[PDB]
C-alpha cells in the first residue's frame, strides 16, 4: 500500500506521464484526432483494415467449407422433406463433381439427419451461397458502408422425373405460380430492409433442341434485386449457410483422389466435422460482435475540440466517457479481428482439423480467378482465398501497430479523466 502519490509515480513513471497528458488539451485533442484517423482505418478503409479482413475471412471460411464438401454431400427427395421415387433436382452455380451444378437425385431414402439433405434445406443453403459468391465477386464494402446493395443476384435450378414436385411454387396470396412462363414477385426481409425477388417458371420438353437430359423439365429462375451487401447482412448469410449444413447434418461420402491430400474420415455426417463448424461459427459470431462496435464508434465522434479559462480535468471532462467508449470499441474491434484469424490460422491447429485447413479449405483447384467463381474443378477445395485472406489480415494488423498504441493511449487518457471526473 502506497500512502501518497509521489512514491507511486517515482515507481510507475509512465503513469506520471499519463497524468501530465490528461491535464493538457493539446495532447487530449491529438489523441482525439487519432481516434478519428484509426476509426477511418477500421471502418472506412478496406484492404488496410484488420476488421474488414476478418469479416472477409469469416465469410470466405463458411463458403470454402461448402466448396470443399458439397459435391460429396448427398441430397434428394421431394418437397417438405419427403422421399421421392424418381426425382432429380439440379442446382446451378454450385461446386458439384466435375461440374458447376450439384445434382440432388437420391430416391427412396428419407431426407434427414445422417441421410440426404432435403431439397427444402438445399434451397435455403443455395440462396445464401449464391448471394455470398456474388457479393464476394463484386467485392465487399468497408464496414461503415451499411447501406450498399448488390444490384442483381440471380440463380436457377431445374426439376425432372416422374412425380418431382420441387419446382411447384406456392405464392404469398395462395395461388400456384404458372408452371410455363409464369412470373411474380416475392419480397423478404434481409437485414432490416425489403428485397424484391422475381420468381419465374419455364417448361422445356424432351424433344426440344439442346435438352442434353432428353427428359422434360421445369426450370425455376430466381432473380433477386438490390440485395443488401453490408457485413452485418453477409455475415447473416454465412450464418445461414453453415447452420443450415450443421442442422441438416446430411450424409457425405468423398471420392478420395490418390496423390492428393487425404480426407478424414472418408464418409459420415457433415455435422461430424465439429471442430471445423465450431470454428466457422465462432468466426462469424466474433465478426458480428466486431461489426457491432461500428455503431459505438459512430455514436461518439471525437472531432469536437476540448478546452475561456484553464482546463480542469475534474470538471471540464464530459467528453471523457464518449472518448473511452470509442477507444475501447476500437480496441475491441482490433482484438476481435485478431481472434478471427487465430480461430482458423493453421499455425495453431492440430491433427484432423489442421489437415482440413491446409489440405482442403486453404487451397483452390481452378486456374487465380476472381472471388465467387464456380467451375468444374472448384469442388473438393475451398476456392475462397482463405490463405490470402489470413495473410492480408496479418499484413493489415502489422500496419496497424502505431494506431493500436494511439488507441491504448487515448483509452488511458480517457479513463484517467473519467476517474478524476467522478468524485464530482
Amino acid at each position, epitope marked *: 500500500n502506497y500512502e501518497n502519490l509521489s512514491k507511486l509515480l517515482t515507481r510507475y513513471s509512465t503513469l506520471n506521464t499519463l497524468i501530465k497528458l490528461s491535464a493538457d488539451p493539446s495532447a487530449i485533442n491529438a489523441a482525439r484526432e487519432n481516434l478519428g484517423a484509426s476509426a477511418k482505418n477500421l471502418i472506412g478503409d478496406t484492404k488496410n483494415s484488420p476488421a474488414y479482413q476478418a469479416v472477409l475471412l469469416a465469410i470466405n471460411a463458411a463458403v470454402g467449407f461448402w466448396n470443399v464438401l458439397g459435391y460429396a454431400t448427398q441430397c434428394g427427395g421431394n418437397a417438405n422433406g419427403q422421399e421421392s421415387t424418381s426425382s432429380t433436382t439440379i442446382f446451378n452455380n454450385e461446386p458439384g463433381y466435375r461440374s458447376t451444378s450439384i445434382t440432388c437425385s437420391l430416391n427412396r431414402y428419407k431426407p434427414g439427419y445422417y441421410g440426404p439433405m432435403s431439397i427444402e434445406n438445399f434451397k435455403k443453403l443455395n440462396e445464401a451461397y449464391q448471394i455470398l459468391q456474388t457479393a464476394l465477386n463484386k467485392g465487399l464494402p468497408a464496414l461503415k458502408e451499411n447501406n450498399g446493395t448488390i444490384k442483381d443476384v440471380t440463380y436457377s435450378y431445374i426439376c425432372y422425373g416422374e412425380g418431382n414436385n420441387n419446382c411447384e411454387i406456392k405464392l404469398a396470396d395462395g395461388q400456384k405460380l404458372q408452371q410455363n412462363g409464369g412470373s411474380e414477385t416475392t419480397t423478404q426481409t434481409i437485414d432490416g430492409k425489403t428485397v424484391s425477388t422475381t420468381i419465374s417458371s419455364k417448361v422445356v420438353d424432351s424433344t426440344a433442341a439442346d435438352n442434353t437430359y432428353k427428359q422434360s423439365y421445369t426450370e425455376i429462375t430466381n432473380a433477386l434485386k438490390d440485395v443488401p451487401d453490408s457485413a452485418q447482412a453477409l455475415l447473416a448469410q454465412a450464418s445461414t449457410l453453415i447452420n443450415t449444413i450443421n442442422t441438416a447434418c446430411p450424409y457425405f461420402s468423398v471420392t478420395n483422389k490418390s496423390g492428393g491430400p487425404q480426407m478424414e474420415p472418408t464418409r459420415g455426417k457433415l455435422c461430424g466435422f465439429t471442430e471445423e463448424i465450431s470454428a466457422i461459427q465462432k468466426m462469424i459470431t466474433d465478426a458480428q460482435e466486431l461489426v457491432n462496435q461500428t455503431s459505438v464508434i459512430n455514436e461518439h465522434e471525437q472531432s469536437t475540440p476540448v478546452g475561456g479559462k484553464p482546463f480542469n480535468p475534474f470538471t471540464d471532462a464530459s467528453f471523457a466517457q464518449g472518448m473511452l467508449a470509442n477507444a475501447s470499441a476500437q480496441a475491441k474491434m482490433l482484438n476481435l479481428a485478431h481472434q478471427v484469424g487465430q480461430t482458423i490460422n493453421p499455425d495453431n491447429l492440430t491433427g484432423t482439423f489442421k489437415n482440413f485447413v491446409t489440405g482442403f479449405l486453404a487451397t483452390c483447384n481452378n486456374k487465380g480467378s476472381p472471388p465467387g467463381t464456380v467451375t468444374t474443378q472448384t469442388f473438393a477445395s475451398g476456392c475462397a482465398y482463405v490463405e490470402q485472406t489470413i*495473410t492480408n489480415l496479418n499484413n493489415s494488423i*502489422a500496419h496497424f501497430g502505431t494506431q493500436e498504441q494511439q488507441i491504448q493511449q487515448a483509452e488511458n487518457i480517457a479513463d484517467t479523466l473519467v476517474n478524476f471526473g467522478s468524485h464530482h
Partner: nanobody
Amino acid sequence: VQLQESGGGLVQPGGSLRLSCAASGSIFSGNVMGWYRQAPGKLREWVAAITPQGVPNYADSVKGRFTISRDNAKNMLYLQMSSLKPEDTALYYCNRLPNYRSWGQGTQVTVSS
C-alpha cells in the same frame, strides 16, 4: 505467455546493437510480432513489426536503420539496430500484435556522445 528481451546497453552515436526476445509459443506462434520502445518522459512508441511469413514494416523514425526478423523454428524475435542516435535511447520491448496485455521487463538501450 512470456516475454523476455535482452541485448541492450550503452553505445556511441553511429553504433549498432542486436536485440533479442524470447517469446512463448502461445504469444509467438502464427502471430504478427513487433518491437516497441519507451523513452524517458514519453509513452510507449511502436517501432517495427513482422508477420509470420516474415514481411516487416517500420515506423518512419527508424526506417532505413533498423531491421526486424523472426526465427519461427525457435520462437525468437530480433531487432538489428544501426546508426544509433541519442533519440533512440529508450527501453525496448517486444510483444505480439495486437498486444498481449502483460509486458516484458524490457531491455535498456542508451546512446550517448
